[PDB]
Amino acid sequence: NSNICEVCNKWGRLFCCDTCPRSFHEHCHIPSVEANKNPWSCIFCRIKTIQERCPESQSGHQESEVLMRQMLPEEQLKCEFLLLKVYCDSKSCFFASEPYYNREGSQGPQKPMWLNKVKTSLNEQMYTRVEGFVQDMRLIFHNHKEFYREDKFTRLGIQVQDIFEKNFRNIFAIQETS
Ligand SMILES: [Zn+2]
Ligand SMILES: [Zn+2]
Ligand SMILES: [Zn+2]
């Protein structure tokens, strides 16, 4: 197995996947690495299994249909993996914890949002449809773009949103378009 966490790329107290060579810190994995379970399979492995059990799940889908899906176990897992893919980017640090807003010429958003809030929300089964999760994720980046206006720091929002959207289209097999 790898000797660094797949998500944050640091060593430390790592849990090793039994079906692939990836490793994780306990709270870097989503969901948090389970207490017992031997063997243990990581979320990358669990997602690959879904795909292998239903090859047709990779055919293109309309985003509007995906968003209306209820958060049954497989959709819960897919949203956990998509959230994990965003944390895998080091620029996610900017969006992880609760933001605050005091900048001359800007007003803070009406509905602040951040990754760890989404993480808790998923853990607590607060989303009933995929749409709930996707709306909160998109709101993170839209709040950032609106607040930072013409400062070049706005680009961090564009960058991390692009990671989110590419992974969304991949994980949920959204139909490719020009
Ligand atoms: Zn880690
Ligand atoms: Zn694995
Ligand atoms: Zn089948």
Side-chain angles (χ1 to χ4, degrees), residues 113-138:
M113 194 49 63
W114 59 103
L115 302 166
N116 293 351
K117 186 174 170 59
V118 180
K119 183 181 277 202
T120 295
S121 296
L122 270 175
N123 177 248
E124 294 182 7
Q125 304 162 298
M126 297 284 294
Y127 301 111
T128 57
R129 289 168 196 274
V130 171
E131 184 180 45
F133 166 82
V134 173
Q135 284 173 340
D136 278 355
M137 294 291 286
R138 286 176 170 164

mmCIF file of all heavy atoms in Angstrom, residues 113-138:
data_model
loop_
_atom_site.group_PDB
_atom_site.id
_atom_site.type_symbol
_atom_site.label_atom_id
_atom_site.label_comp_id
_atom_site.label_asym_id
_atom_site.label_seq_id
_atom_site.Cartn_x
_atom_site.Cartn_y
_atom_site.Cartn_z
ATOM 1 N N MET A 113 -21.603 28.759 3.063
ATOM 2 C CA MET A 113 -21.478 27.349 2.900
ATOM 3 C C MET A 113 -20.008 26.966 2.789
ATOM 4 O O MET A 113 -19.209 27.731 2.281
ATOM 5 C CB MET A 113 -22.270 26.908 1.617
ATOM 6 C CG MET A 113 -22.513 25.399 1.480
ATOM 7 S SD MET A 113 -23.169 24.513 2.893
ATOM 8 C CE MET A 113 -24.713 25.350 2.998
ATOM 9 N N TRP A 114 -19.660 25.785 3.264
ATOM 10 C CA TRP A 114 -18.347 25.291 3.282
ATOM 11 C C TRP A 114 -18.284 23.779 3.277
ATOM 12 O O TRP A 114 -19.289 23.120 3.629
ATOM 13 C CB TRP A 114 -17.520 25.921 4.462
ATOM 14 C CG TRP A 114 -18.071 25.694 5.860
ATOM 15 C CD1 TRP A 114 -17.589 24.816 6.731
ATOM 16 C CD2 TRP A 114 -19.182 26.340 6.507
ATOM 17 N NE1 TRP A 114 -18.316 24.841 7.890
ATOM 18 C CE2 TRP A 114 -19.262 25.801 7.785
ATOM 19 C CE3 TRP A 114 -20.052 27.388 6.151
ATOM 20 C CZ2 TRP A 114 -20.208 26.225 8.715
ATOM 21 C CZ3 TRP A 114 -21.020 27.806 7.055
ATOM 22 C CH2 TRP A 114 -21.124 27.168 8.313
ATOM 23 N N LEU A 115 -17.139 23.224 2.895
ATOM 24 C CA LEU A 115 -17.013 21.758 2.689
ATOM 25 C C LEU A 115 -17.335 20.966 3.941
ATOM 26 O O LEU A 115 -18.023 19.960 3.919
ATOM 27 C CB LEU A 115 -15.688 21.303 2.070
ATOM 28 C CG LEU A 115 -15.382 21.936 0.696
ATOM 29 C CD1 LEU A 115 -13.913 21.703 0.324
ATOM 30 C CD2 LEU A 115 -16.266 21.309 -0.413
ATOM 31 N N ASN A 116 -16.775 21.386 5.073
ATOM 32 C CA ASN A 116 -17.020 20.611 6.303
ATOM 33 C C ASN A 116 -18.464 20.621 6.724
ATOM 34 O O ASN A 116 -18.885 19.674 7.327
ATOM 35 C CB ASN A 116 -16.144 21.127 7.449
ATOM 36 C CG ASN A 116 -14.644 20.898 7.257
ATOM 37 O OD1 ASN A 116 -14.141 20.208 6.364
ATOM 38 N ND2 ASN A 116 -13.850 21.602 8.131
ATOM 39 N N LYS A 117 -19.233 21.629 6.377
ATOM 40 C CA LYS A 117 -20.658 21.703 6.612
ATOM 41 C C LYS A 117 -21.374 20.670 5.743
ATOM 42 O O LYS A 117 -22.294 19.963 6.217
ATOM 43 C CB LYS A 117 -21.228 23.068 6.420
ATOM 44 C CG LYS A 117 -22.671 23.238 6.783
ATOM 45 C CD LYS A 117 -23.037 24.693 6.660
ATOM 46 C CE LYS A 117 -24.522 24.971 6.767
ATOM 47 N NZ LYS A 117 -24.999 24.480 8.053
ATOM 48 N N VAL A 118 -20.972 20.617 4.505
ATOM 49 C CA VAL A 118 -21.523 19.576 3.554
ATOM 50 C C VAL A 118 -21.171 18.184 4.051
ATOM 51 O O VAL A 118 -22.019 17.265 4.035
ATOM 52 C CB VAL A 118 -21.058 19.794 2.091
ATOM 53 C CG1 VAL A 118 -21.654 18.715 1.178
ATOM 54 C CG2 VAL A 118 -21.508 21.150 1.593
ATOM 55 N N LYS A 119 -19.942 17.986 4.505
ATOM 56 C CA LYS A 119 -19.495 16.727 5.071
ATOM 57 C C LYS A 119 -20.422 16.280 6.245
ATOM 58 O O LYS A 119 -20.915 15.143 6.291
ATOM 59 C CB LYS A 119 -18.041 16.776 5.494
ATOM 60 C CG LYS A 119 -17.540 15.487 6.007
ATOM 61 C CD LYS A 119 -16.091 15.470 6.476
ATOM 62 C CE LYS A 119 -15.166 15.272 5.342
ATOM 63 N NZ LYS A 119 -13.902 14.747 5.929
ATOM 64 N N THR A 120 -20.614 17.175 7.187
ATOM 65 C CA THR A 120 -21.530 16.905 8.329
ATOM 66 C C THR A 120 -22.941 16.604 7.856
ATOM 67 O O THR A 120 -23.627 15.702 8.355
ATOM 68 C CB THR A 120 -21.469 18.101 9.253
ATOM 69 O OG1 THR A 120 -20.129 18.104 9.755
ATOM 70 C CG2 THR A 120 -22.508 17.965 10.363
ATOM 71 N N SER A 121 -23.414 17.381 6.909
ATOM 72 C CA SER A 121 -24.749 17.191 6.365
ATOM 73 C C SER A 121 -24.934 15.839 5.744
ATOM 74 O O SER A 121 -26.003 15.160 5.931
ATOM 75 C CB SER A 121 -25.149 18.309 5.358
ATOM 76 O OG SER A 121 -25.219 19.611 5.999
ATOM 77 N N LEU A 122 -23.956 15.400 5.019
ATOM 78 C CA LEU A 122 -24.007 14.026 4.452
ATOM 79 C C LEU A 122 -23.961 12.968 5.523
ATOM 80 O O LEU A 122 -24.655 11.924 5.479
ATOM 81 C CB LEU A 122 -22.788 13.808 3.539
ATOM 82 C CG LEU A 122 -22.945 14.161 2.130
ATOM 83 C CD1 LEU A 122 -21.600 14.004 1.393
ATOM 84 C CD2 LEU A 122 -23.991 13.253 1.437
ATOM 85 N N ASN A 123 -23.111 13.171 6.511
ATOM 86 C CA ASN A 123 -22.962 12.225 7.634
ATOM 87 C C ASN A 123 -24.265 12.071 8.415
ATOM 88 O O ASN A 123 -24.598 10.937 8.864
ATOM 89 C CB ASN A 123 -21.796 12.622 8.569
ATOM 90 C CG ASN A 123 -21.660 11.687 9.792
ATOM 91 O OD1 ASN A 123 -21.902 12.103 10.956
ATOM 92 N ND2 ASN A 123 -21.304 10.463 9.548
ATOM 93 N N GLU A 124 -24.997 13.157 8.574
ATOM 94 C CA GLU A 124 -26.214 13.218 9.344
ATOM 95 C C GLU A 124 -27.443 12.869 8.448
ATOM 96 O O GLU A 124 -28.557 12.987 8.918
ATOM 97 C CB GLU A 124 -26.349 14.570 10.055
ATOM 98 C CG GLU A 124 -25.244 14.754 11.143
ATOM 99 C CD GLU A 124 -25.286 16.056 11.995
ATOM 100 O OE1 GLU A 124 -26.261 16.833 11.869
ATOM 101 O OE2 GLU A 124 -24.333 16.302 12.821
ATOM 102 N N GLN A 125 -27.223 12.428 7.206
ATOM 103 C CA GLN A 125 -28.316 12.093 6.243
ATOM 104 C C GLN A 125 -29.311 13.225 6.139
ATOM 105 O O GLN A 125 -30.492 12.995 6.180
ATOM 106 C CB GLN A 125 -28.977 10.748 6.646
ATOM 107 C CG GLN A 125 -27.996 9.606 6.752
ATOM 108 C CD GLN A 125 -28.473 8.401 7.536
ATOM 109 O OE1 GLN A 125 -28.754 8.501 8.721
ATOM 110 N NE2 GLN A 125 -28.439 7.253 6.908
ATOM 111 N N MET A 126 -28.842 14.468 5.914
ATOM 112 C CA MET A 126 -29.696 15.618 5.827
ATOM 113 C C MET A 126 -30.161 15.881 4.419
ATOM 114 O O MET A 126 -31.101 16.595 4.227
ATOM 115 C CB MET A 126 -28.994 16.874 6.400
ATOM 116 C CG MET A 126 -28.676 16.712 7.884
ATOM 117 S SD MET A 126 -30.083 16.893 8.973
ATOM 118 C CE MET A 126 -30.516 18.611 8.772
ATOM 119 N N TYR A 127 -29.536 15.288 3.415
ATOM 120 C CA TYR A 127 -30.001 15.506 2.040
ATOM 121 C C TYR A 127 -30.945 14.332 1.634
ATOM 122 O O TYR A 127 -30.588 13.192 1.843
ATOM 123 C CB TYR A 127 -28.872 15.538 1.029
ATOM 124 C CG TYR A 127 -27.845 16.641 1.308
ATOM 125 C CD1 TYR A 127 -26.582 16.320 1.727
ATOM 126 C CD2 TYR A 127 -28.177 17.943 1.170
ATOM 127 C CE1 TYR A 127 -25.638 17.306 1.936
ATOM 128 C CE2 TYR A 127 -27.291 18.970 1.482
ATOM 129 C CZ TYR A 127 -25.980 18.626 1.829
ATOM 130 O OH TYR A 127 -25.051 19.636 2.077
ATOM 131 N N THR A 128 -32.119 14.648 1.077
ATOM 132 C CA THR A 128 -33.007 13.620 0.595
ATOM 133 C C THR A 128 -32.847 13.348 -0.872
ATOM 134 O O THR A 128 -33.254 12.273 -1.295
ATOM 135 C CB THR A 128 -34.453 13.953 0.881
ATOM 136 O OG1 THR A 128 -34.762 15.206 0.305
ATOM 137 C CG2 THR A 128 -34.732 14.029 2.387
ATOM 138 N N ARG A 129 -32.334 14.321 -1.668
ATOM 139 C CA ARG A 129 -32.078 14.128 -3.084
ATOM 140 C C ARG A 129 -30.655 14.605 -3.432
ATOM 141 O O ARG A 129 -30.111 15.471 -2.766
ATOM 142 C CB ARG A 129 -33.085 14.861 -3.963
ATOM 143 C CG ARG A 129 -34.480 14.179 -3.888
ATOM 144 C CD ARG A 129 -35.516 15.012 -4.483
ATOM 145 N NE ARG A 129 -36.856 14.576 -4.087
ATOM 146 C CZ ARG A 129 -37.604 13.634 -4.657
ATOM 147 N NH1 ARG A 129 -37.187 12.839 -5.700
ATOM 148 N NH2 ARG A 129 -38.835 13.477 -4.128
ATOM 149 N N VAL A 130 -30.104 14.078 -4.507
ATOM 150 C CA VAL A 130 -28.803 14.517 -4.981
ATOM 151 C C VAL A 130 -28.762 16.045 -5.175
ATOM 152 O O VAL A 130 -27.710 16.717 -4.916
ATOM 153 C CB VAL A 130 -28.424 13.819 -6.278
ATOM 154 C CG1 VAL A 130 -27.195 14.397 -6.909
ATOM 155 C CG2 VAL A 130 -28.190 12.347 -6.013
ATOM 156 N N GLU A 131 -29.883 16.631 -5.631
ATOM 157 C CA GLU A 131 -29.991 18.056 -5.813
ATOM 158 C C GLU A 131 -29.559 18.887 -4.555
ATOM 159 O O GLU A 131 -28.934 19.923 -4.728
ATOM 160 C CB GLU A 131 -31.449 18.400 -6.123
ATOM 161 C CG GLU A 131 -31.728 19.806 -6.434
ATOM 162 C CD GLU A 131 -33.259 19.948 -6.717
ATOM 163 O OE1 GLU A 131 -34.080 19.370 -5.926
ATOM 164 O OE2 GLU A 131 -33.554 20.533 -7.787
ATOM 165 N N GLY A 132 -29.904 18.433 -3.369
ATOM 166 C CA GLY A 132 -29.536 19.122 -2.124
ATOM 167 C C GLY A 132 -28.052 19.233 -1.953
ATOM 168 O O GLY A 132 -27.535 20.354 -1.636
ATOM 169 N N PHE A 133 -27.367 18.150 -2.216
ATOM 170 C CA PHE A 133 -25.919 18.105 -2.068
ATOM 171 C C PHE A 133 -25.265 19.010 -3.147
ATOM 172 O O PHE A 133 -24.386 19.801 -2.887
ATOM 173 C CB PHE A 133 -25.427 16.680 -2.191
ATOM 174 C CG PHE A 133 -23.954 16.518 -2.387
ATOM 175 C CD1 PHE A 133 -23.107 16.561 -1.307
ATOM 176 C CD2 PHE A 133 -23.425 16.263 -3.651
ATOM 177 C CE1 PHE A 133 -21.719 16.472 -1.494
ATOM 178 C CE2 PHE A 133 -22.017 16.147 -3.840
ATOM 179 C CZ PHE A 133 -21.204 16.237 -2.752
ATOM 180 N N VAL A 134 -25.671 18.828 -4.411
ATOM 181 C CA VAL A 134 -25.102 19.584 -5.510
ATOM 182 C C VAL A 134 -25.361 21.066 -5.341
ATOM 183 O O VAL A 134 -24.452 21.860 -5.587
ATOM 184 C CB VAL A 134 -25.568 19.061 -6.915
ATOM 185 C CG1 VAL A 134 -25.100 19.962 -8.053
ATOM 186 C CG2 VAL A 134 -25.108 17.594 -7.103
ATOM 187 N N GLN A 135 -26.544 21.461 -4.925
ATOM 188 C CA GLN A 135 -26.836 22.892 -4.690
ATOM 189 C C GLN A 135 -25.889 23.495 -3.656
ATOM 190 O O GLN A 135 -25.376 24.598 -3.881
ATOM 191 C CB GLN A 135 -28.257 23.154 -4.236
ATOM 192 C CG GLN A 135 -29.124 23.023 -5.411
ATOM 193 C CD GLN A 135 -30.634 23.087 -5.100
ATOM 194 O OE1 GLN A 135 -31.098 22.877 -3.965
ATOM 195 N NE2 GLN A 135 -31.412 23.251 -6.186
ATOM 196 N N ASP A 136 -25.688 22.819 -2.566
ATOM 197 C CA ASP A 136 -24.769 23.340 -1.489
ATOM 198 C C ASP A 136 -23.355 23.398 -1.996
ATOM 199 O O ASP A 136 -22.654 24.359 -1.725
ATOM 200 C CB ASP A 136 -24.768 22.465 -0.238
ATOM 201 C CG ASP A 136 -25.986 22.764 0.735
ATOM 202 O OD1 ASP A 136 -26.722 23.696 0.452
ATOM 203 O OD2 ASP A 136 -26.183 21.997 1.682
ATOM 204 N N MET A 137 -22.896 22.378 -2.738
ATOM 205 C CA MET A 137 -21.528 22.431 -3.301
ATOM 206 C C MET A 137 -21.347 23.604 -4.261
ATOM 207 O O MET A 137 -20.348 24.384 -4.150
ATOM 208 C CB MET A 137 -21.167 21.112 -3.983
ATOM 209 C CG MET A 137 -21.071 19.930 -3.029
ATOM 210 S SD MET A 137 -19.631 20.068 -1.912
ATOM 211 C CE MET A 137 -18.265 19.701 -3.008
ATOM 212 N N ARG A 138 -22.338 23.807 -5.149
ATOM 213 C CA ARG A 138 -22.234 24.891 -6.112
ATOM 214 C C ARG A 138 -22.275 26.263 -5.429
ATOM 215 O O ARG A 138 -21.629 27.214 -5.905
ATOM 216 C CB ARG A 138 -23.310 24.722 -7.207
ATOM 217 C CG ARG A 138 -22.930 23.582 -8.155
ATOM 218 C CD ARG A 138 -24.066 23.365 -9.186
ATOM 219 N NE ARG A 138 -23.578 22.450 -10.219
ATOM 220 C CZ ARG A 138 -24.360 21.805 -11.092
ATOM 221 N NH1 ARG A 138 -25.686 21.895 -11.003
ATOM 222 N NH2 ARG A 138 -23.779 21.024 -12.031
#
